[PDB]
Structure formats: C-alpha cells, structure tokens
Design a protein around this motif. Structure first.
Motif, PDB file in Angstrom:
ATOM      1  N   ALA A 193      54.679  -6.134 141.073  1.00  0.00           N
ATOM      2  CA  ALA A 193      55.105  -5.549 139.809  1.00  0.00           C
ATOM      3  C   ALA A 193      54.185  -5.951 138.667  1.00  0.00           C
ATOM      4  CB  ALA A 193      56.542  -5.956 139.499  1.00  0.00           C
ATOM      5  N   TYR A 194      53.669  -7.176 138.688  1.00  0.00           N
ATOM      6  CA  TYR A 194      52.790  -7.615 137.610  1.00  0.00           C
ATOM      7  C   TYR A 194      51.318  -7.306 137.841  1.00  0.00           C
ATOM      8  CZ  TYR A 194      56.463 -10.351 135.294  1.00  0.00           C
ATOM      9  OH  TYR A 194      57.609 -10.769 134.662  1.00  0.00           O
ATOM     10  N   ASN A 248      49.305  -4.785 135.859  1.00  0.00           N
ATOM     11  CA  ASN A 248      49.013  -5.267 134.522  1.00  0.00           C
ATOM     12  C   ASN A 248      47.975  -6.377 134.525  1.00  0.00           C
ATOM     13  OD1 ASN A 248      49.190  -5.433 131.778  1.00  0.00           O
ATOM     14  ND2 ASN A 248      50.904  -6.851 131.828  1.00  0.00           N
ATOM     15  N   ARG A 286      57.580  -8.892 145.508  1.00  0.00           N
ATOM     16  CA  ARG A 286      57.914  -7.740 144.680  1.00  0.00           C
ATOM     17  C   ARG A 286      57.503  -7.975 143.237  1.00  0.00           C
ATOM     18  NH1 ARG A 286      64.187  -6.439 146.314  1.00  0.00           N
ATOM     19  NH2 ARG A 286      63.865  -5.536 148.394  1.00  0.00           N
ATOM     20  N   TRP A 317      44.684  -7.212 132.309  1.00  0.00           N
ATOM     21  CA  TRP A 317      44.416  -8.485 131.645  1.00  0.00           C
ATOM     22  C   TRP A 317      43.003  -8.964 131.925  1.00  0.00           C
ATOM     23  CZ3 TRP A 317      46.863  -9.955 127.711  1.00  0.00           C
ATOM     24  CH2 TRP A 317      48.230  -9.737 127.585  1.00  0.00           C
TER      25      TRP A 317
END
Lengths: 99, 96, 51, 431
Positions: free
Chosen positions: C15-16, C19, C11, C23
């Motif tokens: 979630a990251y 992003n 999870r 990056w």
C-alpha cells in the motif's frame, strides 16, 4: 403657478384620492414641485392617509418634508404643529421608532 | 386576537421568508394600537431595500471596484515594463 | 488466513510502495537542486536547456 | 417482507408483519426542525407535546391507544399504536385529533401547561444532558446561518415567545396533503388501511409547504462551551457527510462502521477489531466514542463524538483518531472492510427489523417522504456487498483527506488545542 392657487388646485385634485397608488402618485408629484408644501396640504395629506387605509406613507411624508424642509428651524416648527396633529393622528417619527 | 405576535420581530434581518405575502395579508387597520415592534414591519415591508430601492453598488463592491482599477492599472504598467525596453539612442553623454 | 508480517504488513508495504517510489523521486529532485554549482555533477546536470 | 405504497394526494405506505401482536398507525409529516426560522424555533417540539398532552393522552387511553411522536430535522411523526383489531379506532382518533379539530387541543390552559412543561424539558436538556447538547451544537456550528442548524428541541429564548398564533401558522403552512405520509406498520394489511382511509375522508389540507430560500451548506468552524465545573470533557468532531439519495450513502456508513463504537468499561468492547484501540487503551485516553454517519435531506455529517476524563490528553485522543481517519485514504485493508460489512449488516438489520412497530413507522415514513419508496433490506445487503476497498479509498479522498471539520465541545476542554492543529492533522504530511 403661485402659492395659493397651487394649494387650492392640488387639494382639489388631492381629495380625489380613493386608492393607494393614486394618493401616493399625487403625493409624489404635488411634493416634487418648486415650492415647499403648505401646512394645509400636509393636513389634507395626513387625512387622505387616514382615508386610504395605510400608515407607512403617513410616515414617508414626514421624512420627505425632513429632506425638503430646507433648514432646521422650519423643521422644528413643523414638528410642533405636526406634533399636536400627530397627537390627533397617531403616527410616529422615524427618530422615535429606530427601525 | 387581531394583533401580531412577535413571530419575526426583526424584519430588517430577513426577507428570506418564502411567503412574505402571508405576513403582508396579516396586516390590519386600528391605527395606533399597532404594537410598534411590528409597526416597524409595515414601514420596512412597504419601504425597505430589495428589488426596487436596491443600491447600485453594494457596500462590499465599491472597495472591489477601486481595488480592481488599481490592479488593472498595475498589470498594465507592469506588462509595459516587461514587454520592451531595448535599443534606444546612442548614449547619455552624446546628449550632453 | 495468516499474513507475512514483522509488525509491518505485506499489504501495508504494497500500500505504501507506490508512494515510496515518488518519495525517492522527490529526494532525487532535492539532490538535483542542492548539487548544482558542483562542477563534477555539471557533466550530467546541464543537458536540455539550462545552459 | 414487502413494502407497498399507494396515493390519493396522501401517501399510504405499510409493512404487514403478520407475526407481530400490535399495529401502529400514524401520519408522518415531511416538515421537521429544518423548516423553521430561528424565531419560531421549537414549534415542532411544542406540537409534539400538545399531541402528547394529558387530556389528549387520556382520551386516547380510554380506548386502549398509546400515542407516540418524534421530531427530527427532516420529518415529524404522530403515531398511534393499538391492538390489531382497533385500526379503525386509531384512524378515527387521529382524525379527531388533527383533522376534525385543533381548538380543543389549543385551549388556553392546555397550551400554557404544555409551554411550561416544554420550557422545563428544554432547560433540563440544556443543563444536564451533555453529549446530546454537544451534538446539537455540532449541528449548530457545522451548518450555521442555514436552516439545518436549528436544534429540534428548540431554544429557551425563542420558545418563551411562542403563542397559539404561531402554532396555528406552522400548522397551516406545514401540516398539508402532499407534505404528509400516513403510515401503518405492524399487524395490519395494506388493503384494510386504504379501504378504511377511503371509508372516512381524512383530508388534511390543500397543500404546498413553503420553500426554503437557502440550501444547506457545510461550514468548517468550531464552538467551545468550556465549563470547568464538569467532571468530563465531551467533544464531537465531524466533516461534511453524505446526504440521502447519494451513491456514497452505504460507503459513508461503512466508513463510520470501520472505526465503530467503544466503551472502555465493558470487557467485550475493549477486544474489538479496531486498530485505534491499540493506541487508545494504553494510557486510557477516553471512556467511550462512537462514529456516526448522519444523513439529512440536503447534507450530512460524518465524524465521532466522545467523552473522556483524561483531560490532559485530549489532543492525543484527537491525534490518534484522525491518523486512523487518514488510514482510510491511503491503506485501509481488506479485513477491516469485511469486518465493517458484517457489522453494518448486523446493526442495519437490527435497526430496520427490530420488533418495535413505532420505530418501523418512523423509519418508513422518513424514507418514503424523502425518496418516494422504501428500499427493502435485501437490496441494501447487496449494495453493502458491492463495496470494495477502492470505493472506500475514493470516498475518503473525496470527503476525508484534507477537508474542513466542525468541532463542538463542552466540559474541561482546555486540553483541546486550537482549530489549526486539529485541521492540519486531517492530512498526514507523510503521504
């Protein structure tokens, strides 16, 4: 037009005070002419300020003469005669008050 | 009784009171037992600075006026410098 | 009522990850800054209007 | 359960609990501590303590009536509890206490003794109750130069200037008809209370409390009450929260519930399902904390208060707490949201449905003063069930992610660093 008929005519118009804005309007216009006000005129001014049940206009006449008093020597002379008049009045200087 | 009570003794601090009219109704007339920390109040309430007798330019504003004048003048001169400087006379030597 | 974990959660990884793609994009923008002036990359690096 | 409400200029709102054994009846005014200028501050505390004065409590206790009062930011209350057969006696006593007369309560001796007692209580609060005075300074610096900054307790420099004229002026401007709600909770029926109010007259006043010129606005600041002669370091820290009548009310409370509260000495408190505890229990960074979602009429606060003895690692406490706060915006999980749902259902049903009728009277009076009717608890549980993870992330991005904070601290807070590192720790730089 002269000094004395001015003093007489507007003290006669000035004992017709009866009110706040009436005495304040006649103080305004009788102060705004091209002559310094007589001490008798300001004694009638303080007595009318006692009549109309209002104190801060009795302060306001003093800063008005503080502007119009045209020097410091007549200012100290008015401070003397108006000082023992204050002692029989009860009104403070602004410089004694610091708002 | 019959005198005020230091409810708000610094009247030039706020006229943020909703009902100032109650405080104006509060005033009286015994003449020089007036408790001078609220004989300030009648002079300020009747003769202060709000609405009438409000200065045309506030203390903060005058510096903003001069700052905006200088910023607009700088933007005008800079815009003049970055619109056009091109294609003039022949050469400085020709003038000589 | 378990989870797929290795001290990092699945999870947490999902979630990251939206992003982490950004990056990677910002790192490619960083390489695109620091690698011009290198004439081997300029076969690719000037195309639209830097020329 | 059911909450009814009727009006005649006064507002009568009840909760007939037929299982209870008492019945609280009292008036809940809509003025509070947020309706005072900073020179008459503490006049509501002084009305609380002249209502709870010795002569008044004695006359109350002759008929078997216990008095109660409460001074909040938004609402005052004056509640009279009795047996369920004495609601008429309680109403007639409240009538005689406020409406019919106030000069016998405001005699010279009663007022001077009460002013002495409240001056003693305010001084005792100021120099001995540390986490509450930290929270009061947190309100005093989050909302500064604005009427929500004033403490409910009052200040020593203002409260020793009050005389009876200020008490009567506040009474005439704030103890009014539309400003008030008369509340009956416990074992009374609504129709009995309305028929008994209409049996008397009970008309407080004409009405119209003064309107505040300035609305509440949050202002990021700090205040540091450093006292090196104290054994601990108390510190509150909060952002601008959600006011009442906001759609993000229960979301703000559930965000406060995610990180919960903690007590390092209780064994069952160290085993909670918070991911902050894994960072906080290793080197024993704090003794306790609690996350609060305070909600006022105009604004609100969201943050945490804490206390610690590990005074050299305060910055690590603030650091790990704020990184956990940053987890709300980015990567809060589903299980944390489900856990916060269950715990907030639990504490909300403990708060609204405890057995004490005076607390029900305070809460119902506040709610029907602000939003006109009381939201019952079943619809509250449906609104808590409607919250998803995306709602919490959207709220945290709106209110938490890189927003100004307000800090208050006392004790040995030298280990607490500057404002700027605590402010810059609100955004992670890694997202």
């Amino acid at each position: 037009e002269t000094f004395e008929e001015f003093t007489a005519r507007y003290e006669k118009e000035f004992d017709e005070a009866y009110d706040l804005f009436e005495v304040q309007r006649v103080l305004n216009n009788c102060f705004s002419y091209d002559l310094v006000p007589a001490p008798a005129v300001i004694e009638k001014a303080l007595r009318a300020a006692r009549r109309v049940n209002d104190l801060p206009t009795a302060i306001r006449v003093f800063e008005a003469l503080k502007y119009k008093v045209e020097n410091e020597d007549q200012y100290k002379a008015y401070l003397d005669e108006l000082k023992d008049v204050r002692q029989e009045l009860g009104v403070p200087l602004k410089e004694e008050l610091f708002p | 009784v019959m005198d005020l009570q230091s409810r708000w003794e610094n009247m030039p601090s706020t006229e943020q009171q909703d009902i100032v009219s109650k405080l104006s109704e509060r005033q009286k007339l015994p003449w020089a037992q007036l408790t001078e920390p609220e004989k300030q109040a009648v002079w300020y309430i009747s003769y202060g600075e709000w609405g009438p007798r409000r200065p045309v330019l506030n203390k903060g504003d005058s510096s903003f006026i001069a700052k905006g004048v200088a910023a607009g003048l700088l933007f005008s001169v800079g815009l003049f410098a970055v619109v056009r400087m091109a294609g003039g006379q022949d050469a400085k030597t020709m003038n000589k | 009522t378990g989870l797929h974990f290795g001290r990092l959660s699945l999870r947490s990884l999902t979630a990251y990850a939206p992003n982490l793609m950004l990056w990677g994009g910002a790192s490619m923008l960083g390489l695109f800054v620091f690698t011009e002036g290198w004439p081997k990359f300029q076969d690719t690096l000037y195309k639209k209007i830097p020329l | 359960a059911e909450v009814t409400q009727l009006s005649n200029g006064i507002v009568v709102a009840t909760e007939h609990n037929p299982s209870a054994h008492t019945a609280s009846v009292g008036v809940v005014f809509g003025s509070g501590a947020a309706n005072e200028n900073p020179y008459n501050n503490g006049v509501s505390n002084l009305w609380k303590n002249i209502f709870l004065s010795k002569e008044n409590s004695a006359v109350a206790a002759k008929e078997g009536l216990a008095l109660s009062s409460n001074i909040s930011r938004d609402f005052q209350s004056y509640i009279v509890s009795s047996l369920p057969g004495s609601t008429d006696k309680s109403l007639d006593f409240l009538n005689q206490s406020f409406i019919q007369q106030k000069a016998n309560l405001l005699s010279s001796s009663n007022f001077e003794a009460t002013k002495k007692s409240v001056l003693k209580q305010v001084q005792d609060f100021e120099e001995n109750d540390h986490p509450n005075r930290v929270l009061e300074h947190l309100h005093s610096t989050a909302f500064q130069n604005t009427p929500l900054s004033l403490p409910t307790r009052g200040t020593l420099e203002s409260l020793e200037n009050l005389v009876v004229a200020d008490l009567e002026s506040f009474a005439n401007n704030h103890f009014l008809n539309s400003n008030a709600v008369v509340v009956g909770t416990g074992n009374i029926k609504h129709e009995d209370l309305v028929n008994s109010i209409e049996s008397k007259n009970l008309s407080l006043q004409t009405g119209t409390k003064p309107v505040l010129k300035k609305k509440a606005a949050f202002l990021g600041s700090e205040v540091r009450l450093r006292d090196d002669t104290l054994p601990k370091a108390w510190i509150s820290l909060a952002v601008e929260g959600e006011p009442v009548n906001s759609p993000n009310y229960f979301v703000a409370k559930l965000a406060a519930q995610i990180f919960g509260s903690y007590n390092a000495f209780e064994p069952a408190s160290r085993l909670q399902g918070i991911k902050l505890l894994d960072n906080i229990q290793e080197y024993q960074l704090c003794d306790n904390f609690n996350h609060f979602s305070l909600s006022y009429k105009d604004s609100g606060l969201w943050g945490f208060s804490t206390a610690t003895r590990n005074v050299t690692m305060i910055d690590d406490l603030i650091h790990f707490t704020l990184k956990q706060w940053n987890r709300l915006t980015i990567s809060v999980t589903d299980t944390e949201v489900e856990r916060a749902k269950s715990l907030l259902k639990l504490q909300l049903g403990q708060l609204y449905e405890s057995g004490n009728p005076v607390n029900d009277a305070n809460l119902l009076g506040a709610e029907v003063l602000i939003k006109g009717s009381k939201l019952s608890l079943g619809e509250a549980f449906k609104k808590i069930d409607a919250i998803t993870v995306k709602d919490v992330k959207a709220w945290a991005g709106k209110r938490l992610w890189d927003q100004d904070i307000a800090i208050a601290g006392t004790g040995q807070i030298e280990g607490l660093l500057d404002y700027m590192r605590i402010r810059s720790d609100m955004s992670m730089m890694r997202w």
